[PDB]
């Protein structure tokens, strides 16, 4: 496997553990079908009309390591799959360490604080479990549009 | 400047930060001249006996990303220097962010449980003021000679 084919493999990976995670949530709290998550934009250079290959990688790898918090959040969630939740989590630090190698020209990646991390988790916590279920489905889908976005435009690189 | 001499220059200045921290608790605590920290052993193969670049290389990550927990635990522990404890945390991931492009051959590298990490924080934060100063000076003491054996053997590759 190449390195490229390696990302797409574990893209494609966890994809189908956020799939499996939104079916559990969804068919219990029937929500499918503010937070301030990470998504492309048209500046980012990630789509097709103003691609861009290095300022798309870095707000791949931004993204992914500003979602970490919201997957803790997601596996402090999950009781019966928070194994799951965890795989989730585990795998998308695989990721990010197999993207810091592709992109292994470019510059160091702006990280998260992890103490407002800390505190943006007490409070996503502290809610009802009605805007807890709104929250996991949120971020699933999210997080999901960040991949599928993400998958298309390293297959453009 | 190459890879090698980033990491190199990153690792020194990292330690500037923890000699200023190390100044600061020591001149307060006096303690200065269990907790499971991360150290260097002969297996890994990072002395001039058993060197082995490939081990060597996965350990130096490896004990950085366990490092991190305690990292934060200084964070939360440095009040008029919480900024310099700040910048020691996030320095610390752009030196594992540029070692991840040196592994780029090499397999991902098991990160630790965000979960876990959360629970050793609030039990090393729960303790009175002396043992609080005693686990500081570990961390920076046992930090620093990780980071030291580090640049010796990053040295030699």
């Known amino acids: 496997l190449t390195s490229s084919e390696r990302i797409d493999k574990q893209i494609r990976y966890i994809l189908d553990g956020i799939s499996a995670l939104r079916k559990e949530t969804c068919n219990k709290s029937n929500m499918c079908e503010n937070l301030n998550l990470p998504k492309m934009a048209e500046k980012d250079g990630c789509f097709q009309s103003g691609f ?12 992914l390591l500003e979602f970490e918090v919201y997957l803790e959040y997601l596996q402090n969630r ?9 795989a989730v989590q585990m795998s998308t630090k695989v990721l990010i360490q197999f993207l810091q190698k592709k992109a292994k020209n470019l510059d160091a990646i702006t990280t998260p604080d992890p103490t ?5 988790l007490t409070k996503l916590q502290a809610q009802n479990q009605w805007l807890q279920d709104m929250t996991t ?3 699933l889908r999210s997080f999901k549009e960040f991949l599928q976005s993400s998958l298309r435009a390293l297959r453009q690189m």
Request: hydrophobic share 35%; with cysteine; proline share 0%.
């Open 116 to 120: 407002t991390n800390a505190s943006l």
């Open 52 to 63: 861009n290959e290095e300022t798309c990688l870095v707000k791949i790898i931004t993204g």
């Open 137 to 139: 489905h949120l971020i």
């Open 78 to 86: 999950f009781e019966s799959s928070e194994e799951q939740a965890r």
